[PDB]
Amino acid sequence: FSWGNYINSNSFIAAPVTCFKHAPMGTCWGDISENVRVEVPNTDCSLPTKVFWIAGIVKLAGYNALLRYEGFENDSGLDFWCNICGSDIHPVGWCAASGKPLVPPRTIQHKYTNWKAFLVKRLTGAKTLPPDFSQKVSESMQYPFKPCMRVEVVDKRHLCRTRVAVVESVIGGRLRLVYEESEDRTDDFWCHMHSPLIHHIGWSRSIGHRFKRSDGHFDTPPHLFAKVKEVDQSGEWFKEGMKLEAIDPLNLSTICVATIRKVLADGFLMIGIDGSDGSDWFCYHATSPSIFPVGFCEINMIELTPPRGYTKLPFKWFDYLRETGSIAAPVKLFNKDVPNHGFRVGMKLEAVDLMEPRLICVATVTRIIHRLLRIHFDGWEEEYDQWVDCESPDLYPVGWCQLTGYQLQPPAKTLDSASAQFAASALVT
């Protein structure tokens, strides 16, 4: 499987890197656009040694760039895909700086006679990578989470409690965790290091969350954990028994009828899916975009999943509130920003399968409802589509798996004339 070929064959569009709050280089992507010029190996050569040429970005698909050698003009016949963050991608001037040769592609070697004048007139006023781009890329893939670090995380077999887990490995900022005293040896849980699921040692005791009573393993420094958003300070709050709609943490395809079962400290809530010990309950922060007011699904034309075993169907909230003698959580408690992240229906990305989070897959955004993206797994049925927040750390740009070395599941300031002249000095015909 090749993202470039899939995108070129189908005329697909990819979500830009800047759409992704948590993506490597998200906040250094201003320099990257169509017509940026780079120095890259010239594969259109039969020379003993590796040589380079200039190429321009024809198309960007996340981290992946479709490049055209300079001097091909409109001739797309040798257009090639690369990861723009790859180590063979250099700013213009890198050859002259490094004593490497710029050699015309063989295909166009007689198309121009004065190669130095050609390069000067093409490179003068061009956009290239910043000189530290390479270093920003290397820094974007140093993660402060390390093997042997301990965290608190939900027990996937008993959502109502946490237990301690250890980092086994870190790939692209994703943690492979094993539970301490696990039922098996290894590989129990995958999440992003900025997942809201993981907490400092002491978190559960501190907020009132149930926990399983408890090499070289050490407590993750508390400062490494994602900040929790502050709640509305008015003095009106969630109460036990209030009704709402929530994403089922065991079925990310469904939004369900739900109940506030316990108010914890620091804005955390134990929530139950109605009709399904207290063993079932799962913790959402009050600022979670995975919870919604009564009537959210109906107003936004989303299927609501009714309580397991409830027989007055199709489900009507007015009747269920009266039958159960309960009230809706006030709509004001769920007000939040909808960032302008620039996702559009049809855009391609790499998505975590949240029902099997080890898998990162070829995926499409197929619906947008404020913050909420409907994520489709290309080649699978729509029934397996998942509800995912637009700022989720489980969504990646096209090319993220290639950048970080994670396995991808396939579908089922311009240069001045002195800079141009400097760059062109590396020319060997």
Task: From residue 275, give the alpha-carbon distance in Å to each of 104, 145, 242.
Answer: 70, 39, 15
- The yes or no reply on residue 184 touching Na ion (CB under 5 A) is yes
Q: Residue 301 contacts by C-beta under 8 Å, 6 or more apart in sequence?
A: none
For 223-273, the DSSP string reads: GGSPPPPPPP-SS----TT-EEEEEETTEEEEEEEEEEEEE-GGGEEEEEE
Nearer to Na ion, 88 or 187 (CB): 187
Q: 248 and 254 in contact (C-beta within 8 Å)?
A: yes
Degrees to nearest 5, angle at CA 23 with 17 and 28 = 65
Smallest separation, CB 179 to Na ion (Å)? 9
Task: Label residue 376 exposed, middle or buried (CB < 10 Å: 0-12, 13-18, 19+).
Answer: buried
Smallest separation, CB 233 to Na ion (Å)? 42
Nearer to Na ion, 168 or 298 (CB): 168
Nearer to Na ion, 70 or 188 (CB): 188
> Helix, strand, or coil here: 332?
helix
Q: Report the DSSP pairing between strands 158-171 and 210-211.
A: parallel
Q: Scan residues 46-85 and list those touching Na ion (CB under 5 A).
A: none
Site string for Na ion, 141-180 (x = CB under 5 A): ----------------------------------------
Beta-carbon count within 10 A of 249 CB: 18
Smallest separation, CB 156 to Na ion (Å)? 10
Q: Which stretch binds Na ion (CB under 5 A): 162-170, 185-193, 236-244, 274-282?
A: 185-193
Nearer to Na ion, 184 or 381 (CB): 184
Helices 115-123/417-424 angle, 10° precision: 140
Smallest separation, CB 190 to Na ion (Å)? 10
Smallest separation, CB 184 to Na ion (Å)? 4
Q: Which stretch binds Na ion (CB under 5 A): 11-19, 59-67, 183-191, 200-208?
A: 183-191
Smallest separation, CB 217 to Na ion (Å)? 17
Nearer to Na ion, 177 or 256 (CB): 177
Nearer to Na ion, 150 or 358 (CB): 358
Sign of CA dihedral 119, 121, 124, 128: negative
Nearer to Na ion, 126 or 354 (CB): 354
- The yes or no reply on residue 383 touching Na ion (CB under 5 A) is no
Site string for Na ion, 187-226 (x = CB under 5 A): xx--------------------------------------
Structure tokens that stand for 223 in this block: 């400062």
What is the rounded CA–CA span in Å between residue 285 and residue 368? 22
Provide φ and ψ at 95, rounded to 5°: -60, -55
Q: Report the DSSP pairing between strands 189-192 and 64-69.
A: unpaired
Number of residues engaging Na ion in binding (CB under 5 A): 3
Nearer to Na ion, 86 or 357 (CB): 357
Smallest separation, CB 360 to Na ion (Å)? 18
- The yes or no reply on residue 356 touching Na ion (CB under 5 A) is no
Residues near Na ion, by CB under 5 A:
184, 187-188
